[PDB]
Amino acid sequence: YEYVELAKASLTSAQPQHFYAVVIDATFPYKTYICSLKIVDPTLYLKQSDYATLVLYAKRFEDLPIIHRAGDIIRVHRATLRLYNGQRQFNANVFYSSSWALFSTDKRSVTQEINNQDAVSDTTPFSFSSKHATIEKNEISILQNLRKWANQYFSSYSVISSDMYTALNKAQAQKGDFDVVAKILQVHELDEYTNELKLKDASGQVFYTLSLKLKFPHVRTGEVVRIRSATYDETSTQKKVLILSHYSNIITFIQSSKLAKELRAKIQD
DNA sequence: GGGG
């Protein structure tokens, strides 16, 4: 097809558009089915962060992307562009015509590095909504360019801007929902289905949250994650606990991430 | 319907 760059898409023509973009933030797929993402590309990011928004609709959880890592790439077809509150908000009905495909930016897909498998052909999506989606050559280039940029971006910028999350030392004064960015100091198996994450962000605070072993199998001790949509447990006593919801999400960062690398270094037990 |  014809893939438009995020800032070049039309807010004028009634026709669907297609594009490749980097995924920097995402909700888990949930039912109201939806998945909301924050995407960026070379023409749209934080420069002298800024980003476009992507909402995906479907009639079943199985037809939505599960983003476990910031930095991977996505490409959607039959997307409609709307302007929702200042940002560029792209919409895609997976149940109708639209489709999506995820491409790993690192050598391995999250799911993959967990299972020690090698990628098919790395022009091959590690997950797609299609009925068994493929790609034409005109693309290889685009996908290879976005990947290179992706690492140049994540490598020199924080990506997850200092104002996209809330320091933990300000968690208790929060009313409602907020995001976090911390280092997992420990993963503990409480039982058959869930773990207990011991978190510590740059503020130096220690928090805990319960994560379902399967919603987030990538969770690992010593790693940095971004937690989308937590809440402070007003009923907490000895421990300070954050509470995840169904749309909540635990996100890791591709290996080039400056933010992730720095926090692994700065934060410790 | 989208920070749900």
Swiss-Prot record:
The primary site where this protein sits is nucleus
Which GO MF terms does the UniProt record name? G-rich strand telomeric DNA binding; single-stranded telomeric DNA binding; telomerase inhibitor activity
- What keywords appear on the UniProt entry? Chromosome, DNA-binding, Nucleus, Telomere
List localization entries. Nucleus; Chromosome, Telomere
Gene Ontology biological-process annotations:
regulation of telomere maintenance via telomerase; telomere capping
Q: Which GO terms describe its cellular component?
A: nuclear telomere cap complex; protein-containing complex; telomere cap complex
Q: What does this protein do?
A: May function as protective capping of the single-stranded telomeric overhang. May also participate in telomere length regulation during DNA replication. Binds specifically to the T4G4-containing extension on the 3'strand and protects this region of the telomere from nuclease digestion and chemical modification.
Quaternary structure, from the entry? Heterodimer of an alpha and a beta subunit.
**Further notes on this entry?**
The sequence of the A (or alanine) version is shown. The S (or serine) version differs in only two positions, and the K version in only one. There may be other versions in addition to the S, A, and K versions.
Indicate the family of this protein. Belongs to the telombin family.
Name-wise, this protein is Telomere-binding protein subunit alpha
Q: Which organism was this protein described from?
A: Sterkiella nova (Ciliate)
Q: Which residues of the full protein are shown?
A: 36 to 315 of 495
